[PDB]
Amino acid sequence: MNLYTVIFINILLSLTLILVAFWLPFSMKFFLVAITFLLFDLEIALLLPLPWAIQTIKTSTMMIMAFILVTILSLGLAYEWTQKGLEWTE
Amino acid sequence: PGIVELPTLEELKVEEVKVSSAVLKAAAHHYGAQCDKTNKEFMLCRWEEKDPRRCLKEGKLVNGCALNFFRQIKSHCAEPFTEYWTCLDYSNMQLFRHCRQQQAKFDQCVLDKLGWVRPDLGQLSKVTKVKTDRPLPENPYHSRARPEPNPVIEGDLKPAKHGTRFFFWTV
Amino acid sequence: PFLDIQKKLGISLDRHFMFLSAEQPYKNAARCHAFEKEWIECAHGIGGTRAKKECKIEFDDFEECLLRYKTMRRMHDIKKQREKLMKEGKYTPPPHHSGREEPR
Amino acid sequence: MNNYIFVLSSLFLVGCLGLALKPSPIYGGLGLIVSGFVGCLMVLGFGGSFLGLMVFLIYLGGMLVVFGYTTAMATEEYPETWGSNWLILGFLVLGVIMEVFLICVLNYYDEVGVINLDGLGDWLMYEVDDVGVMLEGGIGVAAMYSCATWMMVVAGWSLFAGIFIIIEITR
Amino acid sequence: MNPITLAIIYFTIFLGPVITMSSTNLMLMWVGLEFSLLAIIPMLINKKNPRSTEAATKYFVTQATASMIILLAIVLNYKQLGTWMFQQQTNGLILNMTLMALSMKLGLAPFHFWLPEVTQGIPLHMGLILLTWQKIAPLSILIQIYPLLNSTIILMLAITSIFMGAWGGLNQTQMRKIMAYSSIAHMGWMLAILPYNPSLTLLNLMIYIILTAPMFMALMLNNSMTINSISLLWNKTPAMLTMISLMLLSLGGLPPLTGFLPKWIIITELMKNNCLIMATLMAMMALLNLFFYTRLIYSTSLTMFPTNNNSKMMTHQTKTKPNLMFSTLAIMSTMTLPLAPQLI
Amino acid sequence: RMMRWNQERRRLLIEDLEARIALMPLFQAEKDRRTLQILRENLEEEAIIMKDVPNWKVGESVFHTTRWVPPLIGEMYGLRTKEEMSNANFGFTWYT
Amino acid sequence: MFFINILTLLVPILIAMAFLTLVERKILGYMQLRKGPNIVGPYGILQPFADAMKLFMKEPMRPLTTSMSLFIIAPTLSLTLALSLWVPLPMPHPLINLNLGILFILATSSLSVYSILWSGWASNSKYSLFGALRAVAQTISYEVTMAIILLSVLLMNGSYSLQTLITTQEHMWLLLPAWPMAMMWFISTLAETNRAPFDLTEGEYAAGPFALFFMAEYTNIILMNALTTIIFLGPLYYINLPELYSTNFMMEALLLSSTFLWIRASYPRFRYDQLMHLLWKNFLPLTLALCMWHISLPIFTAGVPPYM
Amino acid sequence: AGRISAFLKNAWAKEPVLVVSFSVWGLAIIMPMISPYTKYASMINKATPYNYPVPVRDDGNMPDVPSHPQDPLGPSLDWLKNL
Amino acid sequence: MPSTFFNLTMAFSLSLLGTLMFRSHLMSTLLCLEGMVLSLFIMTSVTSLNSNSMSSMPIPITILVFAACEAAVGLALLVKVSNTYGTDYVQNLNLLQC
Ligand SMILES: CCCCCCCCCCCCCCCCCC(=O)OC[C@H](COP(=O)([O-])OCC(O)COP(=O)([O-])OC[C@@H](COC(=O)CCCCCCCCCCCCCCCCC)OC(=O)CCCCCCCCCCCCCCCCC)OC(=O)CCCCCCCCCCCCCCCCC
Ligand SMILES: CCCCCCCCCCCCCCCCCC(=O)OC[C@H](COP(=O)(O)OCCN)OC(=O)CCCCCCCCCCCCCCCCC
Ligand SMILES: CCCCCCCCCCCCCCCCCC(=O)OC[C@H](COP(=O)(O)OCCN)OC(=O)CCCCCCCCCCCCCCCCC
């Protein structure tokens, strides 16, 4: 109930301020950026549960899989780099 | 179908402890050594026989042997324990890290006026063997009997009688 | 499956977390563990045509413990009769249902 | 608060209805954002802290963002769409009312069936370990690293190959 | 397209169906389907022309909707039984939605309208894959659940597919649309026999693949995407007629040729199951496929069409295209009836 | 320093979990008695609430198993107060 | 009592932003060899109120080709997020004690792109849309490291909670370790807040909306510096002295917020292309490398932290 | 040796960031095999009691399992303290 | 559970209806597809949390990843369509009818 109260309060305050305000008187580069950001945000999604995965017993396995993730992500980055995907010189 | 079976209200009626979390936590490490047998017996009943309605005779003994512990504590050495759990209840996670010297007071007092030593790290978190007259339950899941598997054919293999018998294909 | 290379190499990529009676991380039990265990153990070895008819009591138990339609209906019938009685003035709730008692 | 999850699911329904009706690729994005907010809220209601916050941080912050991005950079708003927008807003109103009547008829036809309006606040949580630690959703989503590594390699490979796929499509 | 990109995309194209067929979890099956889609789109769009882009868009939309419906079916089964596999207790509506989705993934009628357009807009080596390798995972998912399907809708889909394939191939003058409708027809036969015997679905699948691959290779020999272009084959490469004609007759399903056996044995099983009326309809309507294959055999091998001049220089030039698989598969597909008891 | 600090943190966590261990039995028995009394109250009420209905066995299980089936919180707090129901469902997910 | 707590939380942060404006002006002046405001009130403490009155008393010339909906809900959203971020912060005890609190911060920070983009799509032009696209791309790109840094530093404390970092730094700051992760975190706070040298979006709104945007900006500034203080500069926590913790937290947050303005006065601007090269070629490699390093550290050391 | 070392110096001058990234990658993949303190991680995360230790019956033949938490017949993690 | 699941299924059906009924755009179809994705994610997570089956939580994660990839390739195709014709309209893809 408390979170609801706080957010409602903030919204009310914002709308009140903005009411008083009135009542007183194509390039593919950006698309490629968005796509790269998708492919890294999903990696964040696959990477966030490490604070719970590092509590397990299969440490030799979590080590492995996390290294796989990071390594192949770096390789994809390097390839997008070599292929001039981070240049901006139209 | 099948009338469920429950126990009456006269029973499952016992003198509860009415004592609070900080108190049970300040007294746990000693309550885990003392009053351990009658606790393991109950935590074996409740797991072998999956029904709780078949371990009330043991839960009552748990409550009794816990009240006896908290009564020994009151008879002898009440003030160190009182201050210890009052200091514990201040925190939110009820942590043992801040109340370390009042804990030493409680421990010395109990070790002098009684014979309780504090379990060392890891001693309570093991799997002990418990003994009792109670028998092990056969069919605890009420495992309805299994069927019979399809009778398996068996016999030395021999080639096909006249081949594939596909239209007019001799072999 | 269609190509039992998994069973060929005697490994497990996808066939250890299929159903509820499987292994959970910290031994945490699932809801219908026992019912599903019984259904599987009783249908093992007679697969399909037989298990759909001579292993049906256990499937009914699993269905009920997972979907709970019958329990819902029971509680709803009870509450409907109780509402009718209260409306007509032939029954009053007790204290522990009304909201006051001595708790444990 | 018995009506909480029902209200949330109804708002999700209305958002997906405002999707089905196609005002424009930008108000559709706003509808998607609202529906996702509500989806996270209901997941948290059912106890999915990690799942809901992940929805927040990835679906909205990562997916609808690039949706609106590509929309603005590769779409033009044409003047006709405004009258039709008002028209489909009226359509949305009519659909809301039709859904209300639908739910009424379904309650009349199946009391304890489709929806138990009498048991609305109930049948949300069926069971929970009261004295149990280590039963959140991260404990499961982190299985991937010890058990179900196959799913992790699958997903990582999808993401890996997506790089090459997109560079070859755009080029 | 560089070697690394080629390798990644084709490894994904190969891995998709392999996961689908080697996984017990419907989620992993769905994963394989998504892999296939993701990795196929770029090859379709390689040329970067309006037609290829349109084909890619149509393919993507259709397959994505289908995948979503399949995943809905899986989620519903999961809520219903707690397990990630279809059993003998799933609400038949789940399985019928799944069948609709798989049929749209394959290209069956009346979920077929996208296949000829896409194949036309697409090149040859891509139609080959789209019509041979992209039929194996969605068919496997069905083979795994054949005991618990609805013969009614299956037979309706199959017969509709036969009919529309015939009535499309009768009109189309383009090699690729003709191949599309032939695929529709043979997949209809497969679905028809599926719930009674899937070994015969697989038989007809392999037969159709062995029959289609070498035909697309024949075409790619001269990139003859049209009847009036393949008619010049008598002057360009006449050593291919003796085999194009036989493979087309086999496709049609003429007795003395491999392509017959599928229809024959499928009709046999349907008769054992008392599906004689459907078998009769199908057997009578396959003759139109045979008709518009004979109409091509004519323009290719039994009569010479008006040729051109620069074909002289085309004769001057040599060639090294048709690898050994052409001959191997064409022979295996035309002269393997004496071995039917083994293929059964 | 972080290593040497987190190891002591681990020891402290083990201590707290050991306290939990030593306590659990008491809690399990108390909880069993509580839920049994809840079900008994609900049954003793249903007995007279549903006396005049035709063909209603009072205490009729929906199973053919004969073994214990943990009840749902709906089953328990269905005849009790809506605030109790809300405390059961949205009580821990609502920040103390 | 809870509403009173909410007031005590909200009013002071708004006052602090309004006076951080003045502090910025005075510091920049004294670094430019001048005074800054001295007149309106003693040392200028009335100038922010004067400016607020002026703005809110102006007349809004709302662009005619626009959409009132996206015109009003953009600054509303900005301020709502900028205020709801301050909620979980342990200072030392939090108003709302959340687990996954830093994740809530990540999400409620990433949600501002929607406003910074709707404003542009509303303003019917092409230059404003260009600027909005570029700013969105910048913010997006830097969110990646803003997330990975925390993902790697939250393995010295095995929990996504902010009330665990206090005991994690009960003996030593998380700066000595991860000072290479901070230097990359201290900057993504500038680029995320479009703060110089990353102000390629303010170097087109009425009085009230501009004021709300200003408020959001400076609130986010204070909050990012507060997060830095709590994470990498864990202050003192004696169980009986939340007063001490709060004093130290305030001091460090003011140090950091003054450092931001130090920088604004000290350095030139960047060029969008070079700004993106910075991340995608210097920060992401090092970030992933140190992520692997910090995944391995708690293993080849026996110092893997707990889950309480 | 000379050519590759000159290459590495050229790098160390031109792009030290790439060098540092790759070297941290190598350290991460290598040190967990050198270190002796690795095993202890699995040892601890096993030693953590997130569950109840369900006991067993004293059926006579089980001498290496204790009847009380304070007996030395069972495991004892004094190595954790000594750590 | 029953009510929220009924409403989630109705929402999926509505979004599929939107897909199968075009309205001259293509973004308005990709958004319906993503709404479907979201509904399925929610239903799966809700069933997992209801059954307490922590051995099935990776499934939402996987489907989210793959839906993201699908959306990415769809957006790329839409971008090409716009780059060529000038609009994300569907009457312009009238080719291949010959
Ligand atoms: C120009 C290009 C054209 C080239 C292609 C020409 C066509 C090919 C030949 C004719 C067609 C194929 C004939 C079928 C072969 C049978 C194989 C089989 O699977 O079943 C056998 C198997 C047993 O056969 P069988 O009748 O019991 O014989 C028992 C033995 O006689 C009893 O003794 P045994 O069982 O102990 O066997 C001992 C063994 C010992 O012999 C040896 O080992 C010596 C090997 C030396 C071989 C060299 C001689 C080659 C002679 C052929 C010449 C061809 C010219 C090309 C070569 C040039 C040479 C310079 O005998 C053999 O090796 C037999 C060799 C097989 C090939 C020759 C055929 C003789 C077999 C008898 C069947 C005769 C055909 C009737 C089919 C009925 C059709 C309805 O199953 C059968 O019962 C027969 C079923 C076959 C029915 C086929 C149905 C389709 C027919 C439609 C025609 C379509 C044909 C494809 C053409 C497509 C056109 C586009
Ligand atoms: C036994 C049981 C019976 C079972 C049923 C049997 C089914 C019936 C068998 C049908 C077999 C043939 C069917 C396909 C007909 C092919 C038509 C054909 O190839 O002839 C047309 C073409 C003429 O070419 P043109 O330009 O006019 O001048 C000659 C230059 N080659 O010809 C060509 O150009 C051919 C290519 C020239 C290559 C050089 C010549 C080498 C020989 C090639 C032809 C081989 C045919 C084998 C016939 C065996 C018959 C069994
Ligand atoms: C017209 C202008 C429009 C602009 C509007 C902009 C508003 C955006 C404001 C920022 C959004 C904040 C997002 C809130 C997510 C909450 C996530 C969270 O952590 O709450 C989980 C909470 C605690 O759970 P947990 O931490 O996991 O463990 C607790 C056990 N002790 O457990 C809970 O689930 C608590 C109950 C959930 C409360 C969430 C309510 C959030 C505020 C609702 C906003 C409503 C706005 C109007 C409707 C939006 C459009 C439809």
Enclosing H/E stretch for H57: strand H56-57
Interchain contact F90–A (C-beta under 8 A) = no
Q: Are I77 and E53 in contact (CB under 8 A)?
A: yes
Q: Are C30 and C20 in contact (CB under 8 A)?
A: yes
* Tokens, residue E81: 């039984």
Residue among E337, E339, E343, E344 to mutate when testing ligand 1 (max atoms within 8 A of CB): E337
Number of CB atoms found within 10 A of residue D120's CB: 16
* Tokens, residue E264: 């024959």
How buried is D91 (Cβ within 10 angstroms: 0-12 exposed, 13-18 middle, 19+ buried)? middle
Q: Are F70 and D127 in contact (CB under 8 A)?
A: yes
Q: Which of residues 49-78 of C touch D (CB under 8 A)?
A: 68-69, 72-73, 75-77
Distance CA C76, CA D112 (A): 7
Cis peptide before G92 (omega within 30 of 0): yes
Contact state of B98 with G239 under an 8 Å Cβ cutoff: yes
Q: Name the residue at shortest CA distance from atom 79 of ligand 1.
A: E338
Q: Are G158 and G295 in contact (CB under 8 A)?
A: no
| Amino acid code (one letter) for B3 | I
Partners of B129 in beta bridges: H56
Q: Are E185 and E283 in contact (CB under 8 A)?
A: no
Q: Are E266 and E192 in contact (CB under 8 A)?
A: yes
How buried is C4 (Cβ within 10 angstroms: 0-12 exposed, 13-18 middle, 19+ buried)? exposed
Our answer on whether the CB atom of E330 is closer than 6 Å to any ligand 1 atom is: no
Number of CB atoms found within 10 A of residue B51's CB: 15
Give Cβ neighbours of residue D159 (< 8 Å, ≥ 6 apart).
A39, A42, A43, A46, A73, A76, I65, I69
Distance CA F14, CA B121 (A): 7
CATH of the domain at A53: 1.20.58.1610
Sign, Cα dihedral of G224, G226, G232, G233: positive
Residue among A3, A8, A14, A16 to mutate when testing ligand 3 (max atoms within 8 A of CB): A3
Distance CA G31, CA E71 (A): 63
Q: Which of E19, E23, E136, E140 to mutate to test the interface with C (most CBs of C within 10 A)?
A: E23
User: How many Å is the Cα radius of gyration of chain B?
Assistant: 30
3-state secondary structure of E16: helix
Cis peptide before E110 (omega within 30 of 0): yes
Distance CA F24, CA A40 (A): 44
Q: Are E185 and E166 in contact (CB under 8 A)?
A: yes
Residue with tokens 């190598």: H26
Q: Which of E208, E294, E195, E194 is nearest to E244 (CA)?
A: E294
Partners of E226 in beta bridges: E174
Distance CA G54, CA G52 (A): 5
3-state secondary structure of B3: strand
Q: Are G283 and G143 in contact (CB under 8 A)?
A: no
Number of domains into which chain I is organized: 1
3-state secondary structure of B33: coil
Interchain contact B151–C (C-beta under 8 A) = no
* Tokens, residue E280: 């009769």
Q: Which of G288, G260, D10 is nearest to I10 (CA)?
A: D10
Our answer on whether the CB atom of E246 is closer than 6 Å to any ligand 1 atom is: yes
Distance CA E151, CA E193 (A): 10
Interchain contact H52–C (C-beta under 8 A) = no
3-state secondary structure of G12: helix
Give the HSE-up count for residue E312: Cα atoms under 13 Å, Cβ half-sphere: 3
Distance CA I67, CA I41 (A): 10
Enclosing H/E stretch for E56: helix E50-81
Number of CB atoms found within 10 A of residue C53's CB: 9
Q: Strand H56-57 vs strand B129-130: parallel, antiparallel, or unpaired?
A: parallel
Give Cβ neighbours of residue E75 (< 8 Å, ≥ 6 apart).
I40, I43, I44, I47
Q: Are A38 and I68 in contact (CB under 8 A)?
A: yes
Distance CA H53, CA B125 (A): 6
Q: Are I7 and D13 in contact (CB under 8 A)?
A: yes
Q: Are G300 and H35 in contact (CB under 8 A)?
A: yes
Enclosing H/E stretch for B130: strand B129-130
User: How many Å is the Cα radius of gyration of chain A?
Assistant: 23
Distance CA D169, CA D153 (A): 24
Minimal Cα distance from I82: which residue of A? Answer: A26
Nearest chain B Cα distance for residue H4, angstroms: 54
Query: Per residue, what are the HEC states of chain A?
Result: CHHHHHHHHHHHHHHHHHHHHHHCCCCHHHHHHHHHHHHHHHHHHHHCCHHHHCCCCCHHHHHHHHHHHHHHHHHHHHHHHHCCCCCCCC
Give Cβ neighbours of residue E166 (< 8 Å, ≥ 6 apart).
E181, E185, E285, E286, E288, E289
Question: DSSP label at E309?
Answer: S
Residue with tokens 């009226």: D90
Distance CA E102, CA E146 (A): 13
Give the HSE-up count for residue G202: Cα atoms under 13 Å, Cβ half-sphere: 15
Distance CA E202, CA E206 (A): 6
Give Cβ neighbours of residue D129 (< 8 Å, ≥ 6 apart).
C28, D135
- Give the one of F21, F33, F37 whose C-beta lies nearest to B125's C-beta: F21
3-state secondary structure of F38: helix
Distance CA G190, CA E10 (A): 43
Ligand nearest E235 Cα, by number?
A: 2
Interchain contact D43–I (C-beta under 8 A) = yes
Query: Per residue, what are the HEC states of chain C?
Result: CCCCHHHHHCCCCCCCCCCCCCCCCCCCCCCCHHHHHHHHHHHCCCCCCCHHHHCHHHHHHHHHHHHCHHHHHHHHHHHHHHHHHHHHCCCCCCHHHHCCCCCC
User: How many Å is the Cα radius of gyration of chain D?
Assistant: 21
Q: Are G269 and G124 in contact (CB under 8 A)?
A: no
Our answer on whether the CB atom of F93 is closer than 6 Å to any ligand 3 atom is: yes
Enclosing H/E stretch for D30: helix D27-45
Nearest chain G Cα distance for residue B38, angstroms: 29
Chain A contact set for I64 (CB, 8 A): 42, 45
| Amino acid code (one letter) for E169 | G
Q: Name the residue at shortest CA distance from atom 35 of ligand 3.
A: F94
Residue with tokens 């083990």: F14
Give Cβ neighbours of residue F32 (< 8 Å, ≥ 6 apart).
B46, B52, B53, B55, B56, B59
Query: Per residue, what are the HEC states of G186-226?
Result: HHHHHHHCCCCCCCCCCCCCCHHHHHHHHHHHHHHHHHHHH
Q: Are A15 and A7 in contact (CB under 8 A)?
A: no
Distance CA E116, CA E121 (A): 9
Helices (H), E122-230: 124-132, 136-143, 151-169, 175-193, 198-222, 227-230
Ramachandran area for residue F55 (φ above 0: left; ψ -120 to 50: alpha; else beta): left
Task: Determine the distance from the C-alpha atom of residue E245 to the mean position of all C-alpha atoms in its chain, rounded to a whole number.
Answer: 19
CATH of the domain at I10: 1.10.287.3510
Domain boundaries, position A64: 2-90
Closest atom of ligand 3 to D50 CA is: 27
Alpha carbon of I11 to those of D14, E25, E33, G243: distances in Å? 8, 26, 24, 51
Q: Are E211 and E259 in contact (CB under 8 A)?
A: yes
Q: Name the residue at shortest CA distance from atom 85 of ligand 1.
A: B169
Q: Which of F1, F4, F5, F92 to mutate to test the interface with G (most CBs of G within 10 A)?
A: F5
Partners of B3 in beta bridges: F60
Nearest chain B Cα distance for residue F63, angstroms: 6
Helices (H), chain G: 2-31, 47-57, 68-84, 101-110, 113-122, 127-153, 165-168, 179-192, 207-232, 242-266, 272-278, 284-300
After which residues does chain G become discontinuous at a C–N distance over 2.5 Å?
Answer: 203
Distance CA B146, CA C37 (A): 13
Partners of B130 in beta bridges: H57
| Terminal Cα-to-Cα distance of chain G (whole angstroms) | 29
Interchain contact E50–C (C-beta under 8 A) = no
Phi, psi (rounded to 5 degrees) for B143:
-75, 95
Interchain contact I83–C (C-beta under 8 A) = no
Q: Which of E248, B124, I68 is nearest to F14 (CA)?
A: B124
Q: Which residues of E298-336 are buried (b: 16+ CB within 10 A; e: fewer)?
A: ebbbeeeeeeeeeeeeeeeeeeeebeeebeebbebbbeb
Distance CA B36, CA B40 (A): 6
Query: How long a stretch of residues is chain G?
Result: 308
Contact state of I75 with A26 under an 8 Å Cβ cutoff: no
Q: Are G90 and G163 in contact (CB under 8 A)?
A: yes
Listing DSSP states for G134-178 in one string gives HHHHHHHHHHHHHHHHHHHHTTTTTSS-SSSHHHHTSSS-SSSTT
Interchain contact D136–C (C-beta under 8 A) = no
Give the HSE-up count for residue F63: Cα atoms under 13 Å, Cβ half-sphere: 22
Phi, psi (rounded to 5 degrees) for F74:
-65, -45
Task: Determine the distance from the C-alpha atom of residue A29 to the mean position of all C-alpha atoms in its chain, rounded to a whole number.
Answer: 19
Contact state of B3 with F12 under an 8 Å Cβ cutoff: no
Q: Name the residue at shortest CA distance from atom 5 of ligand 1.
A: E335
D41 Cα: distance to centroid of ligand 3 (angstroms): 7
Distance CA G39, CA G22 (A): 12
Distance CA F37, CA E221 (A): 85
Our answer on whether the CB atom of A34 is closer than 6 Å to any ligand 3 atom is: no
Contact state of G209 with A30 under an 8 Å Cβ cutoff: no
Q: What is the dihedral of CA G129, G131, G135, G138, to 10 degrees?
A: 110
Listing DSSP states for I41-80 in one string gives HHHHHHHHHHHT-GGGTHHHHHHHHHHHHHHHHHHHHHHH
Alpha carbon of G175 to those of A21, B92, E45, G89, G234: distances in Å? 44, 28, 51, 19, 9
Residue among E234, E241, E242 to mutate when testing ligand 2 (max atoms within 8 A of CB): E242
Q: Which of D151, C12, C4, I62 is nearest to E22 (CA)?
A: C4
Q: Name the residue at shortest CA distance from atom 49 of ligand 3.
A: D34
Distance CA B107, CA B30 (A): 10
Distance CA D76, CA A28 (A): 17
Q: Which of E10, E59, E8 is nearest to E37 (CA)?
A: E59
- Give the one of D44, D127, D130 whose C-beta lies nearest to F72's C-beta: D127
Interchain contact F68–A (C-beta under 8 A) = no
Contact state of F41 with C96 under an 8 Å Cβ cutoff: yes
Nearest chain D Cα distance for residue C94, angstroms: 21
Listing DSSP states for H11-42 in one string gives HHHH-HHHHHHHHHHHHHHHHHHH-SSSHHHH
Contact state of E5 with D168 under an 8 Å Cβ cutoff: yes
Distance CA C6, CA H73 (A): 42
Distance CA I6, CA B112 (A): 67
Distance CA G18, CA G10 (A): 13
3-state secondary structure of E336: coil
Q: Are D142 and A53 in contact (CB under 8 A)?
A: yes
Chain B contact set for G308 (CB, 8 A): 93
Chain F contact set for C70 (CB, 8 A): 62
Minimal Cα distance from G93: which residue of B? Answer: B92
Sign, Cα dihedral of B67, B73, B79, B82: negative
Domain boundaries, position I71: 2-98
Contact state of I53 with C20 under an 8 Å Cβ cutoff: yes
Q: Which residues of D41-51 are buried (b: 16+ CB within 10 A; e: fewer)?
A: bbbbbbbbbbb
Chain I contact set for D147 (CB, 8 A): 55
- List the chains bordering chain A where 3 or more Cβ pairs fall under 8 Å: D, F, G, H, I
Q: Are B78 and B167 in contact (CB under 8 A)?
A: no
Chain F contact set for D122 (CB, 8 A): 74, 78, 85
Name the experiment that determined this structure.
Answer: cryo-EM
Interchain contact C38–B (C-beta under 8 A) = yes
| Amino acid code (one letter) for B126 | K
| Terminal Cα-to-Cα distance of chain I (whole angstroms) | 51
Distance CA E265, CA E340 (A): 10
Give Cβ neighbours of residue D48 (< 8 Å, ≥ 6 apart).
D137, I45, I46, I48, I49
- Give the one of E20, E25, E89 whose C-beta lies nearest to C18's C-beta: E25
Distance CA H71, CA E22 (A): 51
